[PDB]
Amino acid sequence: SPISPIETVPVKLKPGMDGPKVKQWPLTEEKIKALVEICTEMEKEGKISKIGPENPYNTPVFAIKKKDSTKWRKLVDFRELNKRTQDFWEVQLGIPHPAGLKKKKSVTVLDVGDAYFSVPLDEDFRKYTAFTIPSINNETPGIRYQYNVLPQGWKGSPAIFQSSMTKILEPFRKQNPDIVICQYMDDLYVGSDLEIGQHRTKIEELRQHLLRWGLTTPDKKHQKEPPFLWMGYELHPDKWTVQPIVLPEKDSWTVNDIQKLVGKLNWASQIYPGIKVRQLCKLLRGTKALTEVIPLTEEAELELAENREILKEPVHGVYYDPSKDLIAEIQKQGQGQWTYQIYQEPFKNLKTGKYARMRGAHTNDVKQLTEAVQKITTESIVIWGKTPKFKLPIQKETWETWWTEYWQATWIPEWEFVNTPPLVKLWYQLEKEPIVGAETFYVDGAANRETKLGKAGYVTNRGRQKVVTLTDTTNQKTELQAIYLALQDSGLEVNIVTDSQYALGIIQAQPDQSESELVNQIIEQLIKKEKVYLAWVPAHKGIGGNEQVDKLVSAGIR
Amino acid sequence: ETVPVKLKPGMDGPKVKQWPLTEEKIKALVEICTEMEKEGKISKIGPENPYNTPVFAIKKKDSTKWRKLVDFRELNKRTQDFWEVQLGIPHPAGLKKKKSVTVLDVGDAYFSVPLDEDFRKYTAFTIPSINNETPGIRYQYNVLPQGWKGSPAIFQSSMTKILEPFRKQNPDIVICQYMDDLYVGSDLEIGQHRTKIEELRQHLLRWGLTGYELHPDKWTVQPIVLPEKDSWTVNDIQKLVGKLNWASQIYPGIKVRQLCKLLRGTKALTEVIPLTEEAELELAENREILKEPVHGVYYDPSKDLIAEIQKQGQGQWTYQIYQEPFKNLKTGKYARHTNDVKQLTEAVQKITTESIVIWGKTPKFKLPIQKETWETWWTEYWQATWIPEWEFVNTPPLVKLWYQ
Ligand SMILES: N#Cc1cc(Cl)cc(Oc2cc(OCc3n[nH]c4nc(N)ccc34)ccc2Cl)c1
């Protein structure tokens, strides 16, 4: 193998740090042997060099035999040189998504051969790669070597190799603008819209150009055929898809089977529209053993099946036409479950996906819908360099009402309503000012931090009154109780006055779902009322019947 | 020759991620960096440079040309000894006093001065590819980069020369520089001011340096506002003591004891209760109190500045700069095709420049928006050469109205 004529990268050790001096464990003759064979070869090839005992650095070597075979393997444990090596720039910070790929006439995959070894190593660093093949026991000073090229398993090899291959290609890319070259790890992905004529030829100019550089790729015939089985995906000429998802029929489900499942399912979601994983995931909560058997909940079984259905056939995605636009459609699946599909030409999807997240402790569909829009927007920038025009199941007038009166800033890029149910709405609104001839409930809540004993109640202005005793509460929970009380006994239109900024805040937000069951009943209530006015006042300030509910709920509690 | 820059002790280079960017902002950046490369201001770099600072593209203040903006916030924090407790630029108390203050971009000055060979690497940035198809293009500065607060600290000496003439001949013009910008204050007629700014750019132009009108002395109060009404209701009074009771403990010597007494027992909210006069002596005593400043509130040069913004509706946003909560150094509002983010972005810059004009430093913003939404969008509306520090928050229901 060729060892690249190219320039080298300056490599430094971390500051105030010195090369490794780890002692070589003593080996069996078979391994000392093995290693000797292996090493002389690497030296024959230029890959390593023989040093003396003047160079004090040491990194432990080890030979491992075979699974089936009788071949030996050199293993160098660069854990210390690694712990002393500087940090490098992050290799590649994200991986191409198939759907971001522009359709090309022909694409050829060139896998560099023996990459790491095909590239020099900064001469002045070499000394740190020192290793020793021990002699038979202690007797006899070992054989010392040091790398000339990038050693496998060392911190910078991935980085440097990457750089080198960027520098090597620079030229070619100049005098070859229309050819696309994806660089990934030690692979080269090449495509052009030439007729197989100049393509099959341009491929060779590259290989030759790569060869002037020490880089040996395979020739044709030994060049892979499409569909490329790359990275979890199946890359065909005019479509792409995930690699065969095989959903296991089983008698009992262990934590681990369920996990592997959710995994396969989630990966399937990139192109298999409408995959759900909520019920399945739910089972995972609390986690017993890895080997523990979970019993499929009924919803769980129903999910699993809706899934098998979607997968019971095959879906593939198209590639990217930078001229056409991007459309993104989102649909409400279930409980904080969203599904989206991106396409340029109606119904020929580039990719799909889902959004579930619980952003907050209580939330609603308008707040979730925009969270998904954000998640999709970014995702588009990443893949395509631009954002999609959106078609959301929310009415333009609902959006605007919500957007307008909300405390926090929000902004959805271009969009259009699309009557594809369930539709997004607000299940209740609070009055802006007091209902006339409606009862004023002055609610309250207390809870003794010592006994965690609580008292929830109200005192209305039609002289009505109530108080309840709660047992393992907090003030937040008593104050939410008081309001539920007032909701419970008040009918079609109320006026509620609290001193809980917390309950105020919670409710003013129009939640429609909540992590609290208390917040959920209240929601259920507010949804029933015809008119609800809710206002706040400072507490422990002789205000209205505020003090009146105070003595009520404080009596015993505080 | 170059000046030696050294990272604050016990810390090292910025390893900040590059936010993803759109195709159009990417070409804009690719072109720009090629030219800067030819002109030798930034040179490509190798894997051996672990450092990284985000970079973006803006379309300045009402401009068609793309400007490349480098987010040096991390770096500025790590070199803070150098540009602050070393090569610091003293801030003119005078500036906030002038009838007129013009802001001029002076950022192209730096392109002359070279950056210490040993500091360069700290300046790495990346021009990211789309769909991670290729390695991002990595760069490092060879000269004073704009956005890095070390540049003015260094350049400070050469700006003194550039400006000594104009100064000798205009003893009552205040010249301040905060980062890439020059702030020029004068009490002259506007035509006169404009003339001197122009006379100023001539001087600047002989050294290579190639406005935007502020009116400090006209920046007034956002006095907490109590309504005036004929016929009150339990509500309004309830709301009255509410706001009133809150303005106290922040507004030294408020009073409610009267008002409270009108609210006794449990009556409907829809109930009209006339006002006693002593209670009226209360609104007034308070109302009057509100027009006048805080008292006891002084800027602490060693403490950070905070700015909170509340979305009020109809294109209106309120805000307050303070160092201790409810110890407001300054309050105000901002008012408006302008979505929430566009508007919030502009508020953020307005306040930031006032902040610079008055104290010479920027406030840490508490923005009422989703980190994500904001992150993806702001650069669309951003036009300053600096970027302030921000953190996201949820306005406390009561704060919005107590400030309405
Ligand atoms: N293995 C592999 C692999 C992994 C990646 Cl990310 C890219 C890749 O190449 C392309 C793939 C492209 O996709 C569209 C396309 N045109 N022609 C094709 N032929 C195939 N057999 C597969 C995909 C395409 C376009 C340009 C290119 Cl260069 C190959």
Side-chain angles (χ1 to χ4, degrees), chain B residues 317-331:
Chain B
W317 304 73
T318 49
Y319 70 86
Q320 314 96 42
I321 313 202
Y322 63 72
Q323 263 179 323
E324 292 296 312
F326 297 136
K327 278 119 137 216
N328 289 345
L329 266 357
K330 183 175 169 18
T331 66

mmCIF file with all atom_site columns, all heavy atoms in Angstrom, chain B residues 317-331:
data_model
loop_
_atom_site.group_PDB
_atom_site.id
_atom_site.type_symbol
_atom_site.label_atom_id
_atom_site.label_alt_id
_atom_site.label_comp_id
_atom_site.label_asym_id
_atom_site.label_entity_id
_atom_site.label_seq_id
_atom_site.pdbx_PDB_ins_code
_atom_site.Cartn_x
_atom_site.Cartn_y
_atom_site.Cartn_z
_atom_site.occupancy
_atom_site.B_iso_or_equiv
_atom_site.pdbx_formal_charge
_atom_site.auth_seq_id
_atom_site.auth_comp_id
_atom_site.auth_asym_id
_atom_site.auth_atom_id
_atom_site.pdbx_PDB_model_num
ATOM 1   N N   . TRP B 1 317 ? -44.680 46.534 23.495 1.00 0.00 ? 317 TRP B N   1
ATOM 2   C CA  . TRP B 1 317 ? -43.803 45.765 24.358 1.00 0.00 ? 317 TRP B CA  1
ATOM 3   C C   . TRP B 1 317 ? -43.263 46.726 25.383 1.00 0.00 ? 317 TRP B C   1
ATOM 4   O O   . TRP B 1 317 ? -42.931 47.893 25.060 1.00 0.00 ? 317 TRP B O   1
ATOM 5   C CB  . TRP B 1 317 ? -42.637 45.192 23.553 1.00 0.00 ? 317 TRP B CB  1
ATOM 6   C CG  . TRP B 1 317 ? -43.074 44.372 22.386 1.00 0.00 ? 317 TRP B CG  1
ATOM 7   C CD1 . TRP B 1 317 ? -43.611 44.824 21.205 1.00 0.00 ? 317 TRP B CD1 1
ATOM 8   C CD2 . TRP B 1 317 ? -43.062 42.952 22.299 1.00 0.00 ? 317 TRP B CD2 1
ATOM 9   N NE1 . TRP B 1 317 ? -43.959 43.762 20.406 1.00 0.00 ? 317 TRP B NE1 1
ATOM 10  C CE2 . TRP B 1 317 ? -43.607 42.602 21.042 1.00 0.00 ? 317 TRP B CE2 1
ATOM 11  C CE3 . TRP B 1 317 ? -42.595 41.941 23.136 1.00 0.00 ? 317 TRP B CE3 1
ATOM 12  C CZ2 . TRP B 1 317 ? -43.673 41.285 20.600 1.00 0.00 ? 317 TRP B CZ2 1
ATOM 13  C CZ3 . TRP B 1 317 ? -42.711 40.631 22.710 1.00 0.00 ? 317 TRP B CZ3 1
ATOM 14  C CH2 . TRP B 1 317 ? -43.220 40.319 21.446 1.00 0.00 ? 317 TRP B CH2 1
ATOM 15  N N   . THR B 1 318 ? -43.226 46.255 26.624 1.00 0.00 ? 318 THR B N   1
ATOM 16  C CA  . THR B 1 318 ? -42.738 47.062 27.719 1.00 0.00 ? 318 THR B CA  1
ATOM 17  C C   . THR B 1 318 ? -41.453 46.431 28.211 1.00 0.00 ? 318 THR B C   1
ATOM 18  O O   . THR B 1 318 ? -41.190 45.253 27.971 1.00 0.00 ? 318 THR B O   1
ATOM 19  C CB  . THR B 1 318 ? -43.800 47.173 28.821 1.00 0.00 ? 318 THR B CB  1
ATOM 20  O OG1 . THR B 1 318 ? -44.318 45.865 29.133 1.00 0.00 ? 318 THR B OG1 1
ATOM 21  C CG2 . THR B 1 318 ? -44.938 48.063 28.348 1.00 0.00 ? 318 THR B CG2 1
ATOM 22  N N   . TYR B 1 319 ? -40.636 47.212 28.894 1.00 0.00 ? 319 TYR B N   1
ATOM 23  C CA  . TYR B 1 319 ? -39.390 46.663 29.358 1.00 0.00 ? 319 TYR B CA  1
ATOM 24  C C   . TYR B 1 319 ? -38.790 47.483 30.456 1.00 0.00 ? 319 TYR B C   1
ATOM 25  O O   . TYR B 1 319 ? -39.214 48.606 30.734 1.00 0.00 ? 319 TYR B O   1
ATOM 26  C CB  . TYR B 1 319 ? -38.418 46.536 28.209 1.00 0.00 ? 319 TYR B CB  1
ATOM 27  C CG  . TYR B 1 319 ? -37.945 47.867 27.721 1.00 0.00 ? 319 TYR B CG  1
ATOM 28  C CD1 . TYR B 1 319 ? -36.854 48.496 28.316 1.00 0.00 ? 319 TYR B CD1 1
ATOM 29  C CD2 . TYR B 1 319 ? -38.607 48.513 26.693 1.00 0.00 ? 319 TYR B CD2 1
ATOM 30  C CE1 . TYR B 1 319 ? -36.427 49.738 27.894 1.00 0.00 ? 319 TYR B CE1 1
ATOM 31  C CE2 . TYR B 1 319 ? -38.195 49.745 26.268 1.00 0.00 ? 319 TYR B CE2 1
ATOM 32  C CZ  . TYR B 1 319 ? -37.116 50.367 26.892 1.00 0.00 ? 319 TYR B CZ  1
ATOM 33  O OH  . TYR B 1 319 ? -36.698 51.592 26.447 1.00 0.00 ? 319 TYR B OH  1
ATOM 34  N N   . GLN B 1 320 ? -37.825 46.862 31.124 1.00 0.00 ? 320 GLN B N   1
ATOM 35  C CA  . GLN B 1 320 ? -37.221 47.445 32.305 1.00 0.00 ? 320 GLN B CA  1
ATOM 36  C C   . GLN B 1 320 ? -35.816 46.919 32.422 1.00 0.00 ? 320 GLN B C   1
ATOM 37  O O   . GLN B 1 320 ? -35.575 45.739 32.235 1.00 0.00 ? 320 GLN B O   1
ATOM 38  C CB  . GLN B 1 320 ? -38.035 47.062 33.558 1.00 0.00 ? 320 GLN B CB  1
ATOM 39  C CG  . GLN B 1 320 ? -39.551 47.209 33.406 1.00 0.00 ? 320 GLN B CG  1
ATOM 40  C CD  . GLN B 1 320 ? -40.215 45.899 33.028 1.00 0.00 ? 320 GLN B CD  1
ATOM 41  O OE1 . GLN B 1 320 ? -39.879 44.840 33.563 1.00 0.00 ? 320 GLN B OE1 1
ATOM 42  N NE2 . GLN B 1 320 ? -41.131 45.953 32.071 1.00 0.00 ? 320 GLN B NE2 1
ATOM 43  N N   . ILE B 1 321 ? -34.894 47.829 32.691 1.00 0.00 ? 321 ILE B N   1
ATOM 44  C CA  . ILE B 1 321 ? -33.484 47.519 32.849 1.00 0.00 ? 321 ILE B CA  1
ATOM 45  C C   . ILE B 1 321 ? -33.258 47.713 34.337 1.00 0.00 ? 321 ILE B C   1
ATOM 46  O O   . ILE B 1 321 ? -33.757 48.670 34.915 1.00 0.00 ? 321 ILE B O   1
ATOM 47  C CB  . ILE B 1 321 ? -32.633 48.507 32.005 1.00 0.00 ? 321 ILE B CB  1
ATOM 48  C CG1 . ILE B 1 321 ? -33.204 48.636 30.577 1.00 0.00 ? 321 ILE B CG1 1
ATOM 49  C CG2 . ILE B 1 321 ? -31.165 48.148 32.035 1.00 0.00 ? 321 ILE B CG2 1
ATOM 50  C CD1 . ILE B 1 321 ? -32.204 49.118 29.562 1.00 0.00 ? 321 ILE B CD1 1
ATOM 51  N N   . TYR B 1 322 ? -32.585 46.768 34.975 1.00 0.00 ? 322 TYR B N   1
ATOM 52  C CA  . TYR B 1 322 ? -32.346 46.835 36.405 1.00 0.00 ? 322 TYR B CA  1
ATOM 53  C C   . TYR B 1 322 ? -31.157 45.969 36.734 1.00 0.00 ? 322 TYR B C   1
ATOM 54  O O   . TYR B 1 322 ? -30.632 45.241 35.890 1.00 0.00 ? 322 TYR B O   1
ATOM 55  C CB  . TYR B 1 322 ? -33.564 46.357 37.183 1.00 0.00 ? 322 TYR B CB  1
ATOM 56  C CG  . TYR B 1 322 ? -33.915 44.894 36.916 1.00 0.00 ? 322 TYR B CG  1
ATOM 57  C CD1 . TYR B 1 322 ? -33.118 43.856 37.413 1.00 0.00 ? 322 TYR B CD1 1
ATOM 58  C CD2 . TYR B 1 322 ? -35.034 44.548 36.133 1.00 0.00 ? 322 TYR B CD2 1
ATOM 59  C CE1 . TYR B 1 322 ? -33.437 42.536 37.151 1.00 0.00 ? 322 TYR B CE1 1
ATOM 60  C CE2 . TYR B 1 322 ? -35.374 43.242 35.915 1.00 0.00 ? 322 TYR B CE2 1
ATOM 61  C CZ  . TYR B 1 322 ? -34.573 42.234 36.414 1.00 0.00 ? 322 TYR B CZ  1
ATOM 62  O OH  . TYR B 1 322 ? -34.883 40.908 36.142 1.00 0.00 ? 322 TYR B OH  1
ATOM 63  N N   . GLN B 1 323 ? -30.708 46.068 37.970 1.00 0.00 ? 323 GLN B N   1
ATOM 64  C CA  . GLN B 1 323 ? -29.553 45.299 38.393 1.00 0.00 ? 323 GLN B CA  1
ATOM 65  C C   . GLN B 1 323 ? -29.988 44.439 39.572 1.00 0.00 ? 323 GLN B C   1
ATOM 66  O O   . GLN B 1 323 ? -29.518 43.313 39.739 1.00 0.00 ? 323 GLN B O   1
ATOM 67  C CB  . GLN B 1 323 ? -28.410 46.243 38.756 1.00 0.00 ? 323 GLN B CB  1
ATOM 68  C CG  . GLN B 1 323 ? -27.438 46.441 37.644 1.00 0.00 ? 323 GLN B CG  1
ATOM 69  C CD  . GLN B 1 323 ? -26.349 47.392 38.009 1.00 0.00 ? 323 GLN B CD  1
ATOM 70  O OE1 . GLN B 1 323 ? -26.591 48.374 38.704 1.00 0.00 ? 323 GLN B OE1 1
ATOM 71  N NE2 . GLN B 1 323 ? -25.134 47.113 37.544 1.00 0.00 ? 323 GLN B NE2 1
ATOM 72  N N   . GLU B 1 324 ? -30.938 44.980 40.344 1.00 0.00 ? 324 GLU B N   1
ATOM 73  C CA  . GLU B 1 324 ? -31.616 44.288 41.453 1.00 0.00 ? 324 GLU B CA  1
ATOM 74  C C   . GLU B 1 324 ? -33.112 44.323 41.112 1.00 0.00 ? 324 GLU B C   1
ATOM 75  O O   . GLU B 1 324 ? -33.599 45.315 40.570 1.00 0.00 ? 324 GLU B O   1
ATOM 76  C CB  . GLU B 1 324 ? -31.352 45.019 42.768 1.00 0.00 ? 324 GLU B CB  1
ATOM 77  C CG  . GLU B 1 324 ? -29.890 44.934 43.248 1.00 0.00 ? 324 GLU B CG  1
ATOM 78  C CD  . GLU B 1 324 ? -29.466 43.516 43.582 1.00 0.00 ? 324 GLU B CD  1
ATOM 79  O OE1 . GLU B 1 324 ? -30.222 42.818 44.300 1.00 0.00 ? 324 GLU B OE1 1
ATOM 80  O OE2 . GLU B 1 324 ? -28.373 43.107 43.130 1.00 0.00 ? 324 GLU B OE2 1
ATOM 81  N N   . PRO B 1 325 ? -33.837 43.216 41.326 1.00 0.00 ? 325 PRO B N   1
ATOM 82  C CA  . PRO B 1 325 ? -35.239 43.236 40.860 1.00 0.00 ? 325 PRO B CA  1
ATOM 83  C C   . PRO B 1 325 ? -36.096 44.299 41.499 1.00 0.00 ? 325 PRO B C   1
ATOM 84  O O   . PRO B 1 325 ? -35.946 44.597 42.687 1.00 0.00 ? 325 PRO B O   1
ATOM 85  C CB  . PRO B 1 325 ? -35.743 41.837 41.171 1.00 0.00 ? 325 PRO B CB  1
ATOM 86  C CG  . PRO B 1 325 ? -34.505 40.983 41.065 1.00 0.00 ? 325 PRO B CG  1
ATOM 87  C CD  . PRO B 1 325 ? -33.347 41.847 41.553 1.00 0.00 ? 325 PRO B CD  1
ATOM 88  N N   . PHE B 1 326 ? -36.939 44.923 40.681 1.00 0.00 ? 326 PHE B N   1
ATOM 89  C CA  . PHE B 1 326 ? -37.765 46.052 41.119 1.00 0.00 ? 326 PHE B CA  1
ATOM 90  C C   . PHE B 1 326 ? -36.940 47.324 41.432 1.00 0.00 ? 326 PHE B C   1
ATOM 91  O O   . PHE B 1 326 ? -37.499 48.372 41.792 1.00 0.00 ? 326 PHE B O   1
ATOM 92  C CB  . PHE B 1 326 ? -38.652 45.668 42.303 1.00 0.00 ? 326 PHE B CB  1
ATOM 93  C CG  . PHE B 1 326 ? -39.654 44.594 41.989 1.00 0.00 ? 326 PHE B CG  1
ATOM 94  C CD1 . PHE B 1 326 ? -39.862 43.539 42.868 1.00 0.00 ? 326 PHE B CD1 1
ATOM 95  C CD2 . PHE B 1 326 ? -40.387 44.637 40.801 1.00 0.00 ? 326 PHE B CD2 1
ATOM 96  C CE1 . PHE B 1 326 ? -40.779 42.537 42.561 1.00 0.00 ? 326 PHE B CE1 1
ATOM 97  C CE2 . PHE B 1 326 ? -41.318 43.643 40.491 1.00 0.00 ? 326 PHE B CE2 1
ATOM 98  C CZ  . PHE B 1 326 ? -41.514 42.593 41.374 1.00 0.00 ? 326 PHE B CZ  1
ATOM 99  N N   . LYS B 1 327 ? -35.616 47.224 41.274 1.00 0.00 ? 327 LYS B N   1
ATOM 100 C CA  . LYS B 1 327 ? -34.679 48.345 41.423 1.00 0.00 ? 327 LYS B CA  1
ATOM 101 C C   . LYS B 1 327 ? -34.288 48.759 39.990 1.00 0.00 ? 327 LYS B C   1
ATOM 102 O O   . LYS B 1 327 ? -33.141 48.610 39.559 1.00 0.00 ? 327 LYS B O   1
ATOM 103 C CB  . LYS B 1 327 ? -33.435 47.914 42.213 1.00 0.00 ? 327 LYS B CB  1
ATOM 104 C CG  . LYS B 1 327 ? -33.612 47.914 43.725 1.00 0.00 ? 327 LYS B CG  1
ATOM 105 C CD  . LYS B 1 327 ? -33.401 46.517 44.332 1.00 0.00 ? 327 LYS B CD  1
ATOM 106 C CE  . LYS B 1 327 ? -32.558 46.568 45.622 1.00 0.00 ? 327 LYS B CE  1
ATOM 107 N NZ  . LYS B 1 327 ? -31.639 45.397 45.768 1.00 0.00 ? 327 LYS B NZ  1
ATOM 108 N N   . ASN B 1 328 ? -35.292 49.237 39.259 1.00 0.00 ? 328 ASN B N   1
ATOM 109 C CA  . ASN B 1 328 ? -35.185 49.660 37.867 1.00 0.00 ? 328 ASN B CA  1
ATOM 110 C C   . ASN B 1 328 ? -34.354 50.882 37.631 1.00 0.00 ? 328 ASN B C   1
ATOM 111 O O   . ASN B 1 328 ? -34.677 51.946 38.145 1.00 0.00 ? 328 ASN B O   1
ATOM 112 C CB  . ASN B 1 328 ? -36.567 49.968 37.334 1.00 0.00 ? 328 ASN B CB  1
ATOM 113 C CG  . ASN B 1 328 ? -37.363 48.756 37.157 1.00 0.00 ? 328 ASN B CG  1
ATOM 114 O OD1 . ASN B 1 328 ? -36.820 47.661 37.167 1.00 0.00 ? 328 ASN B OD1 1
ATOM 115 N ND2 . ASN B 1 328 ? -38.662 48.908 37.069 1.00 0.00 ? 328 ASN B ND2 1
ATOM 116 N N   . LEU B 1 329 ? -33.354 50.736 36.763 1.00 0.00 ? 329 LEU B N   1
ATOM 117 C CA  . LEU B 1 329 ? -32.484 51.830 36.369 1.00 0.00 ? 329 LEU B CA  1
ATOM 118 C C   . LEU B 1 329 ? -33.255 52.507 35.280 1.00 0.00 ? 329 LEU B C   1
ATOM 119 O O   . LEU B 1 329 ? -33.087 53.695 35.043 1.00 0.00 ? 329 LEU B O   1
ATOM 120 C CB  . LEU B 1 329 ? -31.206 51.285 35.753 1.00 0.00 ? 329 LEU B CB  1
ATOM 121 C CG  . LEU B 1 329 ? -29.981 51.091 36.630 1.00 0.00 ? 329 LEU B CG  1
ATOM 122 C CD1 . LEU B 1 329 ? -30.242 51.564 38.013 1.00 0.00 ? 329 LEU B CD1 1
ATOM 123 C CD2 . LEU B 1 329 ? -29.570 49.660 36.646 1.00 0.00 ? 329 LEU B CD2 1
ATOM 124 N N   . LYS B 1 330 ? -34.092 51.737 34.590 1.00 0.00 ? 330 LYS B N   1
ATOM 125 C CA  . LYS B 1 330 ? -34.849 52.283 33.469 1.00 0.00 ? 330 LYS B CA  1
ATOM 126 C C   . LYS B 1 330 ? -35.982 51.401 32.969 1.00 0.00 ? 330 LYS B C   1
ATOM 127 O O   . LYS B 1 330 ? -35.850 50.185 32.879 1.00 0.00 ? 330 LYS B O   1
ATOM 128 C CB  . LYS B 1 330 ? -33.903 52.600 32.311 1.00 0.00 ? 330 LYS B CB  1
ATOM 129 C CG  . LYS B 1 330 ? -34.582 53.240 31.108 1.00 0.00 ? 330 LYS B CG  1
ATOM 130 C CD  . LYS B 1 330 ? -33.555 53.647 30.032 1.00 0.00 ? 330 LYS B CD  1
ATOM 131 C CE  . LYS B 1 330 ? -34.262 54.035 28.752 1.00 0.00 ? 330 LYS B CE  1
ATOM 132 N NZ  . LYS B 1 330 ? -35.700 54.323 29.034 1.00 0.00 ? 330 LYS B NZ  1
ATOM 133 N N   . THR B 1 331 ? -37.083 52.041 32.602 1.00 0.00 ? 331 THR B N   1
ATOM 134 C CA  . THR B 1 331 ? -38.248 51.349 32.068 1.00 0.00 ? 331 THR B CA  1
ATOM 135 C C   . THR B 1 331 ? -38.618 52.063 30.817 1.00 0.00 ? 331 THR B C   1
ATOM 136 O O   . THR B 1 331 ? -38.129 53.157 30.574 1.00 0.00 ? 331 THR B O   1
ATOM 137 C CB  . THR B 1 331 ? -39.426 51.450 32.991 1.00 0.00 ? 331 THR B CB  1
ATOM 138 O OG1 . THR B 1 331 ? -39.822 52.821 33.054 1.00 0.00 ? 331 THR B OG1 1
ATOM 139 C CG2 . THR B 1 331 ? -39.072 50.931 34.369 1.00 0.00 ? 331 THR B CG2 1
#
